[PDB]
Amino acid sequence: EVERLSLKEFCDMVAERKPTPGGGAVGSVVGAMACALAEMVANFTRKKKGYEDVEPEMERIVEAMEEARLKLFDLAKKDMEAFEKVMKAYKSSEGELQNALKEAASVPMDVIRVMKDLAHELEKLAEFGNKNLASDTLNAADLCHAVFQVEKVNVLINLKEISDETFRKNMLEELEEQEAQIEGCYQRVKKMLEGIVWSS
Amino acid sequence: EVERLSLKEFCDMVAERKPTPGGGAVGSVVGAMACALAEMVANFTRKKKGYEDVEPEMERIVEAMEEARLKLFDLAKKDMEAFEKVMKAYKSSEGELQNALKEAASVPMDVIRVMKDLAHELEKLAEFGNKNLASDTLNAADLCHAVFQVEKVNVLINLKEISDETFRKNMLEELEEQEAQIEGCYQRVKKMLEGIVW
C-alpha cells in the first residue's frame, strides 16, 4: 500500500486539501526512514574487521530494522484509516465514536513503541557500531526523537476526546514511560556521539 | 529523479550496504515532508471564513512550500552526488579533494536555509493559520527542527576536513545564524501551540 507511493506522490497528498495523510502518518514514514539509517549503520558494521565480535548483534539489528519499517508503513495506513473511521462517526452514536477514538489513539502510540525500539538500537549502534557512520546514527537519533514528538502530539489530540477515564490514564502512563526510554537513549546517543562533529 | 522513488525503494537504499543516500539525503526528504505539512495547513486556511484577510498570505505559503519541496528533492540528489565526488577524490589531488569537500559541505548548508524558510512559515502558520490544524503545524516544526539538527551534523562533518580556514569560519558563521533563526521560530511556534495538547 503506502510504501508503493512515490516520494512526490506521498508529499503531494500530505500537501493536499484532504486530511487523509496527516502528521501522524508522516511521522511513521519518517520513522521508517530513520530505521533505514540504523539499518545502514548496522550493515556497514557487519563483514568488517574489528567488529566481528558484534556481528551476531548487527545482523540482529538489520533484521529488526527491516521488520520495523514494515510495521511503520502499516501504521501509516492505519493512521489514515483510523481518521476516516473517527470522522465517519462524528455524526453517529457516542458508542461507535468513543471506540473509534480509542483505536485512532492507539495508532501513534504504536508508532512510538517502534520508536522506543529504534532508540534502543541506536544506543547499541552508537556504542558498538561502525565509528565512521556515527553521523548516520546521530541523524537517525535526531529523526527518531522528532517522530516521537510528532506522535506524542497525535496521541494527546486523540486522548482529549475520549471520555473513558481509565483508558486515558493508562495510555498517558504508557506514553510517559516510552517517553522516558526514548529520551534516555536519545540523550545518551547524543552524549556518546556529539564529538564526531569536530574530531577526525 | 529522487521524488519518483517509492517510499519502500528510498528506504531500502538508505538501509542498503551503500553510502549513496545518507543522513543528509534523508534529512532533505524529511524536510520536504515537513514542508508538505506546512502546505496542508496553509491550504486548510485559504477558502475559509474568518481567515479571508490572511488568504493572500496563505496562497503565498502554498506556493513557497511547493517550491521548497523542489529545492529539497534537488538537494537530496546533490548530497549523493556530492558524496560520490568526495569519495572519488580521496585518492586524487588535495586540490580536487578540498574543492569537493567545500561543495559537499554546501549541500546540507543549503538544506538548512530551506529549513530556515520553513521555520519562518511555520511561525506564520502558528499565528495566522487554521486553529484546528495546529497539531500539523507543530508536527512540522518538530520535523523542521530535526532536519536542521541532521543537516548541521552533516555540515560539520565536512567542514572539519576543509583546510581553508576562512571558508570554515564563514560557513560556521552562517550556520550559527541559521541555527538561531530556526531555534527562535521553533521555540515561538512551540510556545504558541503547546496548549492544543490539552
CB atoms within 10 A of CB A100: 23
Transcribe B153-171 into DSSP letters: HHHHHHHTT---HHHHHHH
The distance in angstroms from the start CA to the end CA of chain A is: 43
Which method resolved this structure? X-ray
A39 close to A62: Cβ distance less than 8 angstroms: yes
Residue B58 near residue B46, CB atoms below 8 Å = yes
Radius of gyration of chain A (CA): 18
The C-alpha atoms of residue B115 and residue B27 are separated, in whole angstroms, by 10
Question: Which residue, A40, A139, A36, A146, is CA-closest to B23?
Answer: A139
Helix/strand/coil percent split, chain B, to 5: 80, 0, 15
Q: Which of residues 115-144 of A touch B (CB under 8 A)?
A: 135-136, 138-140, 142-143
Residue of chain A whose alpha carbon sits nearest to that of B38: A15
Contact list in B for residue A142 (CB cut-off 8 A) is 146, 149-150, 153
With contact defined as beta carbons under 8 Å apart, do B81 and B26 qualify?
no
C-alpha B104: how far from chain center? 16
Tell me the sheet residues that pair with A6: B6
Helix A23-43 / helix A55-87 crossing angle, nearest 10 deg: 170
Residues 6+ apart with CB under 8 A from A124: A57, A61
Q: What domain range includes position B44?
A: 1-198
Q: How far is residue A18's CA from residue A14's CA, in Å, rounded to a whole number? A: 8
Could you tell me which of B11, B117, B67 has the C-alpha nearest to residue A143? B11
Q: What is the rounded CA–CA span in Å between residue A129 and residue A131?
A: 6
Burial (CB count <10 Å: 0-12, 13-18, 19+), residue A198: exposed
Q: Give the number of C-alpha atoms closer than 13 A to the C-alpha of residue A93, restricted to the C-beta side.
A: 3
Contact present, B123 and B189 (Cβ < 8 Å): yes
DSSP-assigned letters across all residues of B32-79? HHHHHHHHHHHHTTTT-TT-GGGHHHHHHHHHHHHHHHHHHHHHHHHH
User: If contacts are CB pairs under 8 Å, which of residues 170-189 in chain A contact chain B?
Assistant: none
CB-based contact A58:A42 (threshold 8 Å): yes
Q: How far apart are CA A68 and CA B187, in angstroms?
A: 31
Measured in angstroms, the resolution is: 2.8
Report the sign of the C-alpha dihedral through residues B168, B14, B6, A110, in that order: negative
Tally C-beta pairs within 8 A across A and B: 180
CA A182 to chain centre: 10
Residues in chain B, total: 198
Quote the longest CA-to-CA distance of chain A: 63
| CB < 8 Å from B in window 153-172 of A | 153-154, 156-157, 160
> Is the Cβ–Cβ distance between B138 and B196 less than 8 Å?
yes
Phi, psi of B34 (to 5 degrees): -65, -45
Q: How far apart are CA B181 and CA B173, in angstroms?
A: 13
Which CATH number fits the domain that encloses residue A111? 1.20.120.680
Q: What is the DSSP string of A17-79?
A: SSSSS-HHHHHHHHHHHHHHHHHHHHHTTTT-TT-GGGHHHHHHHHHHHHHHHHHHHHHHHHH
Domain count, chain A: 1
Q: Are B136 and A23 in contact (CB under 8 A)?
A: yes
Lookup: cell for A182: 526514548
With b meaning 16 or more CB within 10 Å and e meaning fewer, what string describes B28-52? bbbbbbbbbbbbbbbbbbbeeeebe
Question: Cell match 506556493: residue?
Answer: B63
Q: In whole angstroms, what is the distance from residue A4 CA to residue B46 CA?
A: 31
A166-175: list long-range contacts, CB under 8 Å, 24+ apart: A167/A102, A171/A105, A171/A109, A174/A109, A175/A109, A175/A112
Distance from CA of B165 to the nearest CA of A (A): 14
Residues A163, A159: Cα–Cα separation, whole Å: 8
Give which of A33, A49, A69, A60 is closest to A146, Cα–Cα: A33
Q: Best residue in A43, A136, A190 to probe B by mutation, most B CBs within 10 Å?
A: A136
User: Using an 8 Å Cβ cutoff, are B21 and B10 in contact?
Assistant: yes
